[PDB]
């Protein structure tokens, strides 16, 4: 706001106002699965087995 | 033939001597258990992946 009376009287009004807001979110999930199944032999017993 | 599947036919055959159908159906079938049913004249070594 800016006024002048009779050229001689000033007055000056200056007003501001900032608001910044700043929201963030970060969400993670690794989910890991191995699985390892190994058959090397198979061994039976002989029929002539005492 | 092996030494065992010689000892099951023979023990098989002296039950039928003996006239004893039950015991040598029992025997057969013990067999048959034992050693399987077809015997494997020919297997191809080899490997696979997937």
């Known amino acids: ?50 | 033939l092996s030494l065992g599947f010689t000892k099951a036919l023979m023990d098989i055959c002296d039950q039928l001597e003996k006239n004893q159908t039950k015991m040598a159906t029992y025997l057969a079938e013990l067999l048959i258990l034992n050693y399987g049913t077809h015997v494997i004249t020919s297997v191809d070594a080899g490997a696979a992946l997937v």
């Open chain 1, 1 to 50: 706001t800016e006024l002048a009376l009779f050229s001689r009287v000033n007055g000056k009004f200056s007003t501001e106002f900032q608001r910044m807001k700043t929201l963030q979110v970060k969400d993670q999930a690794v989910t890991t699965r191995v699985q390892v199944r190994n058959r090397i032999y198979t061994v039976k017993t002989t029929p002539t087995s005492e």
